[PDB]
Amino acid sequence: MRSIPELRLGVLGDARSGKSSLIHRFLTGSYQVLEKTESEQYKKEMLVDGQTHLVLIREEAGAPDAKFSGWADAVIFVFSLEDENSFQAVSRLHGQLSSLRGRGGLALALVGTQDRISASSPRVVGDARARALCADMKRCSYYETCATYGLNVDRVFQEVAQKVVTLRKQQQLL
């Protein structure tokens, strides 16, 4: 039976983060103003190191639980660059993830979304501050995204998938 290599990617963020629109952009190429009130799962095929993977994505509406925290190979944290509470929410969410995971080591990403930046709702989260949150999270890379035109959307997903695959190859290299 031909193997189906699988990458399990979780996505965390508050309702102002832009996480639903970001997931939806990656999957479909479309921007839609969405707030999923609820957790949901999605699937996509991705080429990684020349090998086709099944990618499972769980978007979580609130705090991760031990189920989610133990299932993921990788977790993307999402906040809005114009919402301070969403940024503070990432560090809350990461505390929960870290404690409820009990495994090989997660690939992480931190995403600051640009979608809602306006004159009346300006960027409130400074670059250095966001990069400091990322520097204090293990195996984490930081991106700004804009799902409206696709800025770094595929990049985030692809780079987290690559991290998982490289970690796995490291493990089999031992």
Swiss-Prot record:
Isoform 1 is brain-specific. Isoform 2 is ubiquitously expressed, with highest levels in brain and heart. GTP binds at residues 13-20, 57-61, 113-116. Changing residue 55 to A: In a glioblastoma cell line. Residues 5-170 are annotated as: G domain. The gene is AGAP2. Belongs to the centaurin gamma-like family. Isoform 1 interacts with EPB41L1, PLCG1, NF2, HOMER1 and HOMER2. Isoform 2 interacts with activated AKT1 in the presence of guanine nucleotides, and with the AP-1 complex. This is Arf-GAP with GTPase, ANK repeat and PH domain-containing protein 2. G domain binds GTP and has GTPase activity. Arf-GAP domain interacts with G domain and may regulate its GTPase activity. Residues 2-174 form the GLD domain. GTPase-activating protein (GAP) for ARF1 and ARF5, which also shows strong GTPase activity. Isoform 1 participates in the prevention of neuronal apoptosis by enhancing PI3 kinase activity. It aids the coupling of metabotropic glutamate receptor 1 (GRM1) to cytoplasmic PI3 kinase by interacting with Homer scaffolding proteins, and also seems to mediate anti-apoptotic effects of NGF by activating nuclear PI3 kinase. Isoform 2 does not stimulate PI3 kinase but may protect cells from apoptosis by stimulating Akt.
